Enzyme design. Structure first.
Site, PDB file in Angstrom:
ATOM      1  N   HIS A  61       0.841  -1.365   0.084  1.00  0.00           N
ATOM      2  CA  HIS A  61      -0.034  -0.057  -0.004  1.00  0.00           C
ATOM      3  C   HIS A  61       0.912   1.220  -0.145  1.00  0.00           C
ATOM      4  O   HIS A  61       0.573   2.290  -0.736  1.00  0.00           O
ATOM      5  CB  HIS A  61      -0.936   0.073   1.391  1.00  0.00           C
ATOM      6  CG  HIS A  61      -1.945  -1.116   1.647  1.00  0.00           C
ATOM      7  ND1 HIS A  61      -2.678  -1.506   0.610  1.00  0.00           N
ATOM      8  CD2 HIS A  61      -1.775  -2.120   2.212  1.00  0.00           C
ATOM      9  CE1 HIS A  61      -3.240  -2.744   0.898  1.00  0.00           C
ATOM     10  NE2 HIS A  61      -2.625  -3.238   1.962  1.00  0.00           N
ATOM     11  N   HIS A  91       5.265   6.938   7.098  1.00  0.00           N
ATOM     12  CA  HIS A  91       4.931   6.596   5.990  1.00  0.00           C
ATOM     13  C   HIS A  91       4.448   7.705   5.014  1.00  0.00           C
ATOM     14  O   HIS A  91       4.154   8.756   5.759  1.00  0.00           O
ATOM     15  CB  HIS A  91       3.776   5.297   5.837  1.00  0.00           C
ATOM     16  CG  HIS A  91       2.571   5.617   6.310  1.00  0.00           C
ATOM     17  ND1 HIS A  91       2.044   5.607   7.498  1.00  0.00           N
ATOM     18  CD2 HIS A  91       1.530   6.351   5.810  1.00  0.00           C
ATOM     19  CE1 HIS A  91       0.954   5.882   7.662  1.00  0.00           C
ATOM     20  NE2 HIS A  91       0.487   6.608   6.604  1.00  0.00           N
ATOM     21  N   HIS A  93       1.821   9.253   1.438  1.00  0.00           N
ATOM     22  CA  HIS A  93       0.823   8.821   0.458  1.00  0.00           C
ATOM     23  C   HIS A  93       1.422   9.801  -0.704  1.00  0.00           C
ATOM     24  O   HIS A  93       1.673  10.982  -0.204  1.00  0.00           O
ATOM     25  CB  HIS A  93      -0.406   9.132   1.026  1.00  0.00           C
ATOM     26  CG  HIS A  93      -0.762   8.718   2.081  1.00  0.00           C
ATOM     27  ND1 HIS A  93      -1.664   7.347   2.087  1.00  0.00           N
ATOM     28  CD2 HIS A  93      -0.554   8.656   3.559  1.00  0.00           C
ATOM     29  CE1 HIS A  93      -1.948   7.100   3.213  1.00  0.00           C
ATOM     30  NE2 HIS A  93      -1.238   7.625   4.180  1.00  0.00           N
ATOM     31  N   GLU A 103      -3.476  13.625   1.299  1.00  0.00           N
ATOM     32  CA  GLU A 103      -4.806  13.194   1.972  1.00  0.00           C
ATOM     33  C   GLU A 103      -5.574  14.324   2.330  1.00  0.00           C
ATOM     34  O   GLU A 103      -6.532  14.457   1.834  1.00  0.00           O
ATOM     35  CB  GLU A 103      -4.533  12.216   2.825  1.00  0.00           C
ATOM     36  CG  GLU A 103      -4.001  10.651   2.264  1.00  0.00           C
ATOM     37  CD  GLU A 103      -4.169   9.562   2.998  1.00  0.00           C
ATOM     38  OE1 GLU A 103      -3.896   9.581   4.228  1.00  0.00           O
ATOM     39  OE2 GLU A 103      -4.849   8.594   2.334  1.00  0.00           O
ATOM     40  N   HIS A 116       3.053  10.983   6.975  1.00  0.00           N
ATOM     41  CA  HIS A 116       2.291  10.383   8.556  1.00  0.00           C
ATOM     42  C   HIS A 116       3.323   9.953   9.440  1.00  0.00           C
ATOM     43  O   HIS A 116       3.775   8.580   9.112  1.00  0.00           O
ATOM     44  CB  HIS A 116       1.072   9.808   8.300  1.00  0.00           C
ATOM     45  CG  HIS A 116       0.052  10.111   7.316  1.00  0.00           C
ATOM     46  ND1 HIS A 116      -1.002   9.717   6.638  1.00  0.00           N
ATOM     47  CD2 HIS A 116      -0.186  11.536   7.038  1.00  0.00           C
ATOM     48  CE1 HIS A 116      -1.554  10.479   6.024  1.00  0.00           C
ATOM     49  NE2 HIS A 116      -1.337  11.638   6.524  1.00  0.00           N
ATOM     50  N   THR A 195      -6.610   6.467   7.934  1.00  0.00           N
ATOM     51  CA  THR A 195      -6.794   6.842   6.522  1.00  0.00           C
ATOM     52  C   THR A 195      -6.977   5.756   5.575  1.00  0.00           C
ATOM     53  O   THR A 195      -7.472   5.733   4.363  1.00  0.00           O
ATOM     54  CB  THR A 195      -6.116   7.896   5.939  1.00  0.00           C
ATOM     55  OG1 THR A 195      -4.961   7.646   5.639  1.00  0.00           O
ATOM     56  CG2 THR A 195      -6.092   9.180   6.760  1.00  0.00           C
ATOM     57  N   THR A 196      -6.482   4.633   6.082  1.00  0.00           N
ATOM     58  CA  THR A 196      -6.572   3.112   5.431  1.00  0.00           C
ATOM     59  C   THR A 196      -7.604   2.163   6.295  1.00  0.00           C
ATOM     60  O   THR A 196      -7.380   2.364   7.520  1.00  0.00           O
ATOM     61  CB  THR A 196      -5.171   2.552   5.219  1.00  0.00           C
ATOM     62  OG1 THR A 196      -4.811   2.028   6.409  1.00  0.00           O
ATOM     63  CG2 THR A 196      -4.191   3.264   4.585  1.00  0.00           C
TER      64      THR A 196
HETATM   65  N1  LIG Z   1      -3.533   4.136   7.911  1.00  0.00           N
HETATM   66  C1  LIG Z   1      -2.588   4.314   8.874  1.00  0.00           C
HETATM   67  N2  LIG Z   1      -2.063   5.408   9.393  1.00  0.00           N
HETATM   68  S1  LIG Z   1      -2.489   6.878   8.727  1.00  0.00           S
HETATM   69  N3  LIG Z   1      -2.697   6.649   7.061  1.00  0.00           N
HETATM   70  O1  LIG Z   1      -3.789   6.982   9.269  1.00  0.00           O
HETATM   71  O2  LIG Z   1      -1.574   7.887   9.091  1.00  0.00           O
HETATM   72  N4  LIG Z   1      -2.279   3.248   9.703  1.00  0.00           N
HETATM   73  C2  LIG Z   1      -2.971   1.778   9.388  1.00  0.00           C
HETATM   74  C3  LIG Z   1      -2.369   0.947  10.187  1.00  0.00           C
HETATM   75  C4  LIG Z   1      -1.170   1.855  11.133  1.00  0.00           C
HETATM   76  C5  LIG Z   1      -1.264   3.031  10.737  1.00  0.00           C
HETATM   77 ZN   LIG Z   2      -1.199   7.627   6.379  1.00  0.00          ZN
END
Ligand SMILES: N/C(=N\S(N)(=O)=O)N1CCCC1
Ligand SMILES: [Zn+2]
Length: 257
Positions: A61, A91, A93, A103, A116, A195-196
């Site tokens: 992802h 990570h 996006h 995002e 993030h 956000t995932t």
């Molecule tokens: N979507 C996520 N982080 S985020 N995009 O909201 O920063 N994650 C999914 C599992 C751990 C962190």
């Molecule tokens: Zn993220």
């Protein structure tokens, strides 16, 4: 399983993850005229000098830079937060083109990418328990625009050839995430979600106002990653962002006048 394609992307997630249509989903558009300065916000504290990075992973992802979170070594405190939040991973996006990838949006403006830095509230003991709590997580979000190179990003860029496909990882010790921050810590904050998938509504979002600049070449290397595994047909890892979600009953607060 979920992804970012037409067949498994953000418009489909609600079927397996019904909280996708919840009351506190992320990201959102940050309407800067509607956000209100909050003098109750305490100073924000980013304490990353003892950070211990471990590994970088292509999870199909995005890619995650993981940290040792067994001890208070890299922590976020202050601002809207009560207590102490430990950095577990960061990570990004990003888009297929420079005009999209973030995002969060700012007055509907999309940045080329968004960083993030994910942290969990130490009062809950572990990340898995924290994601069962309404104040379990804090995510520091930082926009990326294309311009000059970000020196502190280059070590990340240079390791991506070794984690091209899903499931690959590489040692990534001794990385200093202080090199990813802009000068200012001015921010917006609101209560939201991952956000995932699983889209859990556990996050205090802290989105910095100041973007960092990265070079065209740096973001081009992000776009050479693959969503697929080794030996499978190539699917470039691009456009791994969820669009803005309804604000619903939320107010975005600003730390700055
Ligand atoms: N979507 C996520 N982080 S985020 N995009 O909201 O920063 N994650 C999914 C599992 C751990 C962190
Ligand atoms: Zn993220």
């Amino acid at each position: 399983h979920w992804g970012y394609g037409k067949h498994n992307g953000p418009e489909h997630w609600h079927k397996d993850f019904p909280i996708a249509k919840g009351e506190r989903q992320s990201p959102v558009d940050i309407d800067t005229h509607t956000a209100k300065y909050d003098p109750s916000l305490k100073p924000l504290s980013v304490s990353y000098d003892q950070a211990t990075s471990l590994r970088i992973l292509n999870n199909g992802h995005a890619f995650n830079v993981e940290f040792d979170d067994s001890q208070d070594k890299a922590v976020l405190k202050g601002g809207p937060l009560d207590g102490t939040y430990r950095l577990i991973q960061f990570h990004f996006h990003w888009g297929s083109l420079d005009g999209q990838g973030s995002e969060h949006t700012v007055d509907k403006k999309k940045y080329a990418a968004e960083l993030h830095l994910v942290h969990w509230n130490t009062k809950y003991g572990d990340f898995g328990k924290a994601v069962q709590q309404p104040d379990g997580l804090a995510v520091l979000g930082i926009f990326l625009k294309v311009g000059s190179a970000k020196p502190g990003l280059q070590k990340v860029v240079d390791v991506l050839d070794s984690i091209k496909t899903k499931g690959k990882s590489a040692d990534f010790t001794n990385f200093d995430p202080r090199g990813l921050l802009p000068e200012s810590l001015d921010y917006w904050t609101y209560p939201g979600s991952l956000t995932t998938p699983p889209l859990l509504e556990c996050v205090t979002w802290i989105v910095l106002k100041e973007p960092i600049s990265v070079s065209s070449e740096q973001v081009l290397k992000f776009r050479k990653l693959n969503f697929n595994g080794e030996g499978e047909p190539e699917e470039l890892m691009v456009d791994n962002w969820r669009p803005a979600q309804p604000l619903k009953n939320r107010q975005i607060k600003a730390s700055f006048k």
